[PDB]
Write a protein that binds this ligand. Structure first.
Ligand code: IRE
Length: 297
């Protein structure tokens, strides 16, 4: 559906601040100024470092993604560079969030984020789409109770060895089941409050380490059931890994008894927001439809 992707002229938006960069592109806070208007509307803009016809084809796919837990591509500007326009998420990315709130995040939040990320990935799988680059740095925070996967389509439009399934490292094979491996690493990032996976180990050594049977270590707050889920995501046989629909169920179950599955100091005073505070967040900055968060029994 072409109506889902707005083609913008470079003249109707401006980049005002660098937010971050990767090997692939640079993300800016930008301002959209509608033609004829004086209002300046904040947006996110990513500029990547015949081809346009292939780019637009993928952009239409990225603009078709409609789910509470995956960010949708809203617009594109094709000049000498490709620029992607998306909704700005003022809370930023989840990796930064867990780092900046280290040991000050309740179990109910951590487990619900795991659910939401699995729901987003399950939606992509239902659409027959593979993400290929799931990582905490590519999950954004809409509100503390609402996270969303971003950077979908990046690979197909344009290498993170330490997030990749072994078969992806060795054979650059990407499937829903290799997405599950990366989901496992992403969960590990959350549960360690943003530790770097395989810290101090060169990327060139990762395949041999995995082949030896070594994996990321159990995070201190994780009980055995949570760690076993992670380990299952990192099995060599792709078909032996959990499915996203299974992950949704498991983390949803744990979210109903959060203190049973994660051990966090001071957890009893870090509950989900009250209905009052939840309604306030939604009214201000989250008016979109979404499944209710899983509360504790
Ligand atoms: C408030 O911060 C962000 C909001 C965002 N809102 C929406 N989208 C973002 N990323 C993004 C990702 C892919 C895209 F195609 C586009 Cl257009 C945008 C965003 C990235 C954002 O920050 C990215 C950089 C985070 N760095 C990580 C390193 O330490 C400094 C902070």
């Amino acid at each position: 559906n072409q109506a889902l992707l707005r083609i913008l002229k470079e003249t109707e938006f401006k980049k005002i601040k660098v937010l971050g960069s990767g090997a692939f592109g640079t993300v800016y806070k930008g301002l959209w100024i509608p033609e004829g208007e004086k209002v300046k509307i904040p947006v996110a803009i990513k500029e990547l470092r015949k081809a346009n016809k292939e780019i637009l084809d993928e952009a239409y796919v990225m603009a078709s993604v409609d789910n509470p837990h995956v960010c949708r591509l809203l617009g594109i500007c094709l000049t000498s560079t490709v620029q992607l326009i998306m909704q700005l998420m003022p809370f930023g990315c989840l990796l930064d969030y867990v780092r900046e709130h280290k040991d000050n995040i309740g179990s109910q939040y951590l487990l619900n984020w795991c659910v939401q990320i699995a729901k987003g990935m399950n939606y992509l799988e239902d659409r027959r789409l593979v993400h290929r680059d799931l990582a905490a740095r590519n999950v954004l925070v809409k509100t503390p109770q609402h996270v969303k996967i971003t950077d979908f389509g990046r690979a197909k439009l344009l290498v993170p060895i330490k997030w990749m399934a072994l078969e992806s490292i060795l054979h650059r094979i990407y499937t829903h089941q290799s997405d599950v491996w990366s989901y496992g690493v992403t969960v590990w990032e959350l549960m360690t409050f943003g530790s770097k996976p395989y810290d101090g180990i060169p990327a060139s050594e990762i395949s041999s380490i995995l082949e030896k049977g070594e994996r990321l270590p159990q995070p201190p707050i994780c009980t055995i059931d949570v760690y076993m889920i992670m380990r299952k995501c990192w099995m060599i046989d792709a078909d032996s890994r959990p499915k996203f629909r299974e992950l949704i169920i498991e983390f949803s179950k744990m979210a109903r008894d959060p203190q049973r599955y994660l051990v966090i100091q001071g957890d009893e005073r870090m509950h989900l927001p009250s209905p009052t505070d939840s309604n306030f967040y939604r009214a201000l900055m989250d008016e979109e439809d979404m499944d209710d968060v899983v509360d504790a029994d």
